[PDB]
Design a protein around this ligand. Structure first.
Ligand SMILES: NC(=O)c1ccc[n+]([C@@H]2O[C@@H](COP(=O)([O-])OP(=O)(O)OC[C@H]3O[C@@H](n4cnc5c(N)ncnc54)[C@H](O)[C@H]3O)[C@H](O)[C@H]2O)c1
Ligand SMILES: NC(=O)c1ccc[n+]([C@@H]2O[C@@H](COP(=O)([O-])OP(=O)(O)OC[C@H]3O[C@@H](n4cnc5c(N)ncnc54)[C@H](O)[C@H]3O)[C@H](O)[C@H]2O)c1
Ligand SMILES: NC(=O)c1ccc[n+]([C@@H]2O[C@@H](COP(=O)([O-])OP(=O)(O)OC[C@H]3O[C@@H](n4cnc5c(N)ncnc54)[C@H](O)[C@H]3O)[C@H](O)[C@H]2O)c1
Lengths: 386, 384, 400
């Protein structure tokens, strides 16, 4: 629930709040890991569990040789993988300057298998993934709802809603032409498609219908890769499945960064990709807009740049924010005894920030994509005095 | 329980009045000593008592050789270092003109002992004053919140707000760095911090197309406000200030001339070396000449002569409102009626008794403290 | 000895073009290590030489058991100090993970000695670092004048330029703060500092109409910069650093405890300092979106990657203007012919062979002096070109 000075609050207040915020000029939707959980998605903990189960030798070596993770820490349920890739890369640069060969196989296989597992926890449908007609499955219904609601609540003089989703899975570009609404992905042509960031000026206008939305993913894509020519590309899904996913899954060759996405601890250790620059240019250039609203469904509070380029620029009271945090009382009790991770402590700032223009939203599992897109209203035509 | 010019007002009506006033263009402030004193600060009387317990050797001779106060007068608690520093300086100048070596040594001791208690109890952090992370200290949250408020309901086309106070509490910049606020106090720079009028005309702008501000003004000298006595007034960071010329004075019982310019004296003109005054009040009066502008005062007796000489002659401009917080207004009214008051009581009772309504009164004990100031100054509301 | 697109032009046209380019609305400058040699800086070769003199028993064992450097490159002073320090931190963390102490204490002493030999040079004032107003010296005063020459001939509402130099001393802070200019670098505040980066993209303006403001883009960090125990970044007045961590870094022998400081590029692998450093790089790159980006190259070793990454990315710009300052080609051609130069020399000489008219080179021996750079800039017509301040200052000083 919501408390204000020791008095309970009703849901209608928050409903009217979000309705009015949507009525503001600009709006944006942030979508974290919770963007797709009911479609078959899994959290990083499940990825690590599958990684350790598939290759127990790696867990044994970690327990014995180096101890980059402790059993008690895993029991505490705080295992982090984001630091493990960067640890491995720093280790391997050290070895490349040291020339220790007999100890490389362990870590190179660790990289290969970890990337395999991470890429495996996002298809959400297994073999069913490959065939067509998936776009019409009941699983992807809510994405259609969002693709409809916010794309038409745009009277002349207002910009289209912003998409900010940062997960592995593929669920945003398959409800697009199912209902015909293009959440712009920007890849022209039929056979040879190239990525051109200069396509940031797309908008339909009726000259002689008038539907557009805005895509901005803070995760890369499950099908973005570098071909040694300094390029990135997303193409059809089953095409990639039949092309290169099988090679990574089975062959497990000496790993080069076949398809580049950056789930890890330090992004700048992956500074080869400046598209991070563009995406966070957008997300740091949007918070400053006055009379703008942000609907945050799934902000894990774990990443650094997100949690440092939110508060650092909230200091103008015309941009309005709110987050859907499932566990309110449990999280408050946990934080009162020391806090959680390094970045999530920023919640305390919003628990105590000097902006009387927000209020936390929670309740538990009832604040995911489903309710997030269901609780919004539909545009009303022909208002009457009443 | 609130009156103005013969018109009654209640709590809800008072809240509406203060909100409507806050919608006016400009609102001033006086976060008097009754804001940080409660948090652990000390008043001039407490400093006087601390000095009395310290240096227990003069009390016998001074009450006999010079008689600057009697036992009955001391009991009455009618002391004020404001004039006592001036009298000590006059005494010592006489001594130097006449060369009573004992008098010179005695009054050097008097000066270098009296200019310490007012400072060495004005840190509120002990030796931690050289450390960092003191901005996030829980003892200043009040300040933090207030500043945010006074920058939220500031719509475009209205001048920046005014904070006017002088007290020895190093607080406001210890509440502007957690919040990212950027107050201005006429100075500039980390390492070489001095006065610079060119910094009085800076406003925040967005180059592409998160900015907070407010105005600071001190009228007595900050604990880090000093000069090299060679036509060079300087300000210094907290740690360097503790390191260079503040540790010995605290804990070495040595001599002390006017090292760092702090003016708790009364005459404030014998020290014509200090031009600070000459400029700061240039703004205070200039702050109150406007119409449809308010001033807030948090627990002020109005003791100073200069303060009640540009204020009483400010109500002449009609729409200039004014606000005073005073718990024990009855005491001042009675003392004035008894005809035994100083600048403070006379001026306060005069401005309360004026038949006009530009006077706004807040009182009732602790209800006039900083808590009401934080509670009342309003946030904007659009979707209640 | 003037080269401009391969076409020779008279001196009058050269000076006219230089003056016209010197008064551009948009200016983007990236000065190299050698460009500031005349300002009193010390090249990293001297730092390494003094380091080896301090501890000449390290290079042999270093190569023998770590191969961190090649013998020839170290002998010829072709090693990277910041890269070596970062790789030393990498070895140190590896040893901490695997408890390779016999290597941890073999790295600790050399790391602290690198500190002792590098930090001692960046202050530029030694015992006078503890004194205020130290930037008033006439030698550096000209720099302030340049700022005036870069601000006294600028119209209102003009675009913001940016100049980044490899040297990262705090002389800029002392100069600006004796000049009374406020600074928005991220450490906004004075008593308990923090890093607030949004103000990067804001500027000071006058409510009535003065136009004196600059952006402190210290991509390199700076001598004060140190992360305290809290996962944040702070700053200190000069005396704080000069009497709490500069001293042991210069006076005591081996007073090294852990990963604390923010120079040079020390803890990249940790998220915090990575966001501390790379954000300025990005936000500069977040500003080079204009078609008139300007670049300058001087003494680049072609060993870096991220800077080289952006260089390769942006080198395909038809509207790119390049100016190179390197008065060493005459003395380097013979060295290259005899035995061959380094990677940077080969790269630059190969690039020069390209028939591009957008690359300019400035030379002429004595003509490349700092003073000549000062006069080459525009000069106000109405400014009094006479010597009267000196006499008045002397008369005032004589009194009392
Ligand atoms: N060029 C680019 O676009 C770019 C740049 C930098 C980073 N990235 C990507 O952006 C970042 C996003 O990664 P991400 O997957 O961690 O973001 P995320 O918000 O989707 O997930 C963060 C975490 O929150 C957890 N979580 C979800 N629901 C929760 C709940 N109810 N309670 C507690 N925890 C919950 C998830 O298990 C875990 O993913 C990664 O660094 C990387 O994937 C992309
Ligand atoms: N900067 C300058 O050069 C300059 C210029 C003009 C005047 N002055 C000085 O300004 C005048 C005021 O000095 P001051 O502002 O530092 O205060 P003060 O020390 O001179 O007066 C006593 C102090 O005790 C506080 N106090 C006492 N009882 C209180 C209560 N019940 N509630 C709240 N606060 C209470 C008052 O706020 C404060 O005035 C002096 O008379 C005069 O010397 C200085
Ligand atoms: N990774 C880089 O190449 C790079 C580039 C610019 C700045 N920095 C900053 O540089 C470090 C601090 O600045 P600094 O004191 O090292 O100034 P610096 O002048 O030494 O650094 C500028 C450049 O000079 C190069 N260089 C250094 N020594 C060289 C040598 N002996 N021969 C050829 N080239 C050489 C370096 O590749 C590069 O850092 C920090 O790690 C980091 O903040 C690093």
């Amino acid at each position: 629930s919501i408390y204000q000075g020791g008095n309970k609050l009703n849901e209608d207040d928050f409903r009217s709040h979000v309705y009015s915020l949507c009525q503001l000029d600009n709006v944006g939707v942030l979508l974290g890991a919770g963007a797709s959980v009911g479609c078959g998605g899994k959290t990083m903990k499940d990825v690590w569990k599958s990684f350790k189960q598939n290759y127990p030798e790696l867990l044994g070596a970690l327990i014995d040789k180096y101890l980059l993770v402790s059993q008690i820490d895993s029991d505490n349920n705080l295992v982090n993988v984001e630091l493990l890739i960067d640890e491995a890369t720093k280790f391997l640069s050290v070895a490349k300057t040291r020339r220790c060969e007999d100890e490389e196989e362990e870590f190179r296989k660790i990289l290969s298998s970890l990337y395999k597992e991470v890429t495996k926890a996002a298809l959400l449908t297994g073999e069913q993934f490959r065939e067509k007609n998936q776009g019409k499955k009941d699983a992807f219904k809510y994405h259609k709802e969002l693709i409809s609601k916010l794309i038409s609540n745009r009277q002349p003089g207002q910009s289209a809603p912003a998409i900010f989703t940062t997960n592995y899975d593929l669920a945003l570009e398959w409800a697009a032409e199912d209902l015909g609404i293009q959440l712009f992905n920007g890849f022209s042509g039929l056979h040879t498609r190239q990525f051109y960031p200069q396509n940031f000026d797309l908008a339909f206008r009726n000259v002689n219908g008038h539907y557009h939305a805005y895509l901005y993913k803070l995760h890369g894509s499950l099908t973005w890769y570098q071909n040694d020519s300094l390029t990135v590309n997303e193409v059809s899904a089953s095409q990639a499945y039949d092309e290169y996913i099988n090679d990574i899954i089975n062959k497990d060759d000496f790993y080069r960064g076949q398809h580049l996405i950056y789930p890890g601890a330090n992004k700048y250790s992956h500074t080869i990709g400046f598209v991070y620059g563009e995406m966070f240019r957008r997300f740091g250039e949007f918070i400053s807009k006055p009379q703008t609203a942000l609907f945050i469904n799934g902000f894990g509070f774990g990443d650094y740049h997100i949690n440092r380029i939110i508060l650092g620029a909230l200091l103008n009271p015309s941009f309005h924010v709110v987050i859907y945090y499932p566990e309110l009382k449990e999280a408050i009790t946990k934080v009162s005894k020391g806090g959680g991770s390094e970045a999530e402590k920023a919640i305390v700032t919003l628990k105590n920030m000097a902006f009387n223009q927000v209020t936390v939203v929670g309740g538990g599992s009832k604040a995911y994509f489903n309710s997030f897109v269901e609780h919004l209203p539909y545009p009303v035509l022909f208002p009457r005095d009443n």
